[PDB]
Amino acid sequence: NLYFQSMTDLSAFPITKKWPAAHPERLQLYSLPTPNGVKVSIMLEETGLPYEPHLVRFDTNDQLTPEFMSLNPNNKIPAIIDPNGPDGKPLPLFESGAILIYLADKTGQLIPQDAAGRYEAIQWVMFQMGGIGPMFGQLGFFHKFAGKEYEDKRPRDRYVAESKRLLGVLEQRLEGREWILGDQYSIADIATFPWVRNLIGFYEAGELVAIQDFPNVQRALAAFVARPAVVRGLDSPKRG
Amino acid sequence: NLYFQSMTDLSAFPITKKWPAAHPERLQLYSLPTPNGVKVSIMLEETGLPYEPHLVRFDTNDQLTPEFMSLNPNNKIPAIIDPNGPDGKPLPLFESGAILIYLADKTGQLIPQDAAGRYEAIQWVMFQMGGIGPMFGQLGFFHKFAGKEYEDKRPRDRYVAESKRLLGVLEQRLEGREWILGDQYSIADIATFPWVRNLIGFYEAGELVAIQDFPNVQRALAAFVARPAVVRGLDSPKRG
Numbered sequence: 206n207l208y209f210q211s212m213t214d215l216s217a218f219p220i221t222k223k224w225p226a227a228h229p230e231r232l233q234l235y236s237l238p239t240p241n242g243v244k245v246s247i248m249l250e251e252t253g254l255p256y257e258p259h260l261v262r263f264d265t266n267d268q269l270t271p272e273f274m275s276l277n278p279n280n281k282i283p284a285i286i287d288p289n290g291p292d293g294k295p296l297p298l299f300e301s302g303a304i305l306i307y308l309a310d311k312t313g314q315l316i317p318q319d320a321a322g323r324y325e326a327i328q329w330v331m332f333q334m335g336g337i338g339p340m341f342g343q344l345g346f347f348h349k350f351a352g353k354e355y356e357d358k359r360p361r362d363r364y365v366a367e368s369k370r371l372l373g374v375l376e377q378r379l380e381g382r383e384w385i386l387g388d389q390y391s392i393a394d395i396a397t398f399p400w401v402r403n404l405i406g407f408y409e410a411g412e413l414v415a416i417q418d419f420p421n422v423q424r425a426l427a428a429f430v431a432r433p434a435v436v437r438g439l440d441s442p443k444r445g
Numbered sequence: 446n447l448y449f450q451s452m453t454d455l456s457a458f459p460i461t462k463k464w465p466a467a468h469p470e471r472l473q474l475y476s477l478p479t480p481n482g483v484k485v486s487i488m489l490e491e492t493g494l495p496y497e498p499h500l501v502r503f504d505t506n507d508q509l510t511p512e513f514m515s516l517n518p519n520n521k522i523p524a525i526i527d528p529n530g531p532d533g534k535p536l537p538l539f540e541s542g543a544i545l546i547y548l549a550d551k552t553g554q555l556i557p558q559d560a561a562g563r564y565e566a567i568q569w570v571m572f573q574m575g576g577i578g579p580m581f582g583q584l585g586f587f588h589k590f591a592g593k594e595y596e597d598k599r600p601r602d603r604y605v606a607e608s609k610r611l612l613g614v615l616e617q618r619l620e621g622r623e624w625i626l627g628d629q630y631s632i633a634d635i636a637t638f639p640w641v642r643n644l645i646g647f648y649e650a651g652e653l654v655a656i657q658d659f660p661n662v663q664r665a666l667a668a669f670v671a672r673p674a675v676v677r678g679l680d681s682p683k684r685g
């Protein structure tokens with residue numbers, strides 16, 4: 206490398222031993238099409254940023270490998286390495302909500318550019334990250350995944366009540382608004398609607414929460430799922 | 446107001462009907478000394494930013510009032526109004542992790558100033574907001590608050606296992622590091638250590654998680670609780 210640049214080398218990141226980069230000039234996404242993974246693929250599809258997706262398979266415990274954990278020591282998807290990071294260096298990152306803020310800043314898309322609006326966006330991303338995701342996820346556990354040994358439905362009922370409470374927050378926020386921040390679709394929507402979708406789809410919790418009681422949520426969710434970039438992001442990484 | 450500035454008027458914010466501002470030139474904090482509330486009071490005490498604390502009492506359901514909910518429609522503490530906000534206007538904000546990022550940016554303290562470091566800080570705040578807080582909180586419910594009607598200890602055991610897993614992430618991260626981001630104490634520490642403290646103190650879950658198995662965590666926690674600004678922040682708002 207005396208006279209010119211090498212092709213992008215990501216070998217400093219041990220995760221690349223397990224999922225080699227065919228396109229090391231592109232952001233590398235290590236994910237699975239779950240509500241948290243699709244936040245990031247949807248963001249990438251919306252913004253048009255090139256990326257190389259890699260399927261992290263739970264059936265083979267891929268997320269528990271040293272290779273995966275070298276990128277995310279929390280053992281969870283999604284995670285990224287952007288080869289074209291700040292200060293001209295690769296940037297590893299995990300936590301879906303952090304990735305959304307990073308990506309919005311990188312190219313100045315899908316976050317308000319005024320300061321107050323930016324902090325409001327971060328607030329609603331935090332609401333999702335600390336409320337929607339954790340609590341809808343616990344309902345999914347107790348309704349869908351928990352076996353017959355959990356005979357007591359009190360934990361389920363706790364998370365039904367909390368999920369309804371959170372849906373009510375969203376419902377009131379969306380009154381008179383197209384999207385969570387008003388007219389402009391943003392990372393707050395990308396963080397939140399995949400979880401509403403999962404709750405009432407995959408988790409089969411739509412009857413428990415009575416989704417029809419939240420007409421603004423139903424409006425915005427229907428709009429969200431129909432966006433072509435959302436449809437693309439929901440199917441990435443490809444399972445086959 | 447023809448010839449000069451009025452004293453700061455926060456009357457546009459209905460929360461001020463319930464907790465009037467004696468010092469409307471200061472950031473207004475609506476909180477209670479819980480792990481999430483003290484993140485913000487600790488940050489304020491660390492940075493030296495003036496603030497006026499207001500005790501939001503759960504015994505009188507203050508957080509469920511229209512006045513409180515006009516600021517945080519999610520009905521939770523902490524929440525703030527900074528009268529001296531971006532663009533010279535007051536800034537309302539909720540979600541502890543969002544407030545921490547706002548405050549660090551406002552005065553350029555306790556977040557790295559280089560881009561990569563900033564995103565790493567946001568990542569670890571997200572780890573706390575989506576992992577530590579929600580999961581330690583569910584353990585607190587099932588261990589401390591849940592009554593005898595929850596005879597099945599399977600939910601408790603689920604959150605014990607998850608809390609131990611999260612403590613292990615923190616433990617490995619702190620190996621060879623003073624604080625979560627290395628040498629420099631930051632908002633990542635402020636977000637996280639109040640929750641470790643609460644888990645092993647108020648929640649009485651220290652035996653369940655065997656805190657002594659996490660010597661780096663014990664080191665950093667002991668350092669954290671001894672900081673004079675932490676001691677001040679843990680006692681704000683004052684209950685009497």
Ligand SMILES: N[C@@H](CCC(=O)N[C@@H](CS)C(=O)NCC(=O)O)C(=O)O
Nearest residue numbers: 239240241281282283300301302575
């Ligand atoms: N707070 C994290 C949560 C990520 C998360 O829950 N990831 C799940 C899939 S949706 C995962 O990787 N689970 C694997 C496991 O727990 O072993 C984020 O938003 O990124």
Ligand SMILES: N[C@@H](CCC(=O)N[C@@H](CS)C(=O)NCC(=O)O)C(=O)O
Nearest residue numbers: 239240241334338339342343346575
């Ligand atoms: N270890 C997890 C495995 C399942 C999992 O990771 N679920 C994700 C969704 S794909 C979750 O609930 N994440 C919570 C969040 O996003 O905060 C569990 O036992 O629930």
Ligand SMILES: N[C@@H](CCC(=O)N[C@@H](CS)C(=O)NCC(=O)O)C(=O)O
Nearest residue numbers: 335479480481521522523540541542
């Ligand atoms: N994700 C929120 C969580 C805040 C939270 O859980 N607040 C609790 C106290 S620590 C609360 O106000 N609970 C009142 C209630 O649920 O009614 C944040 O970090 O600010």
Ligand SMILES: N[C@@H](CCC(=O)N[C@@H](CS)C(=O)NCC(=O)O)C(=O)O
Nearest residue numbers: 335479480481574578579582583586
């Ligand atoms: N409505 C809550 C009341 C208690 C509460 O708000 N707890 C807070 C701690 S003070 C919590 O667990 N917050 C979770 C987080 O921070 O994510 C519950 O039923 O657990």
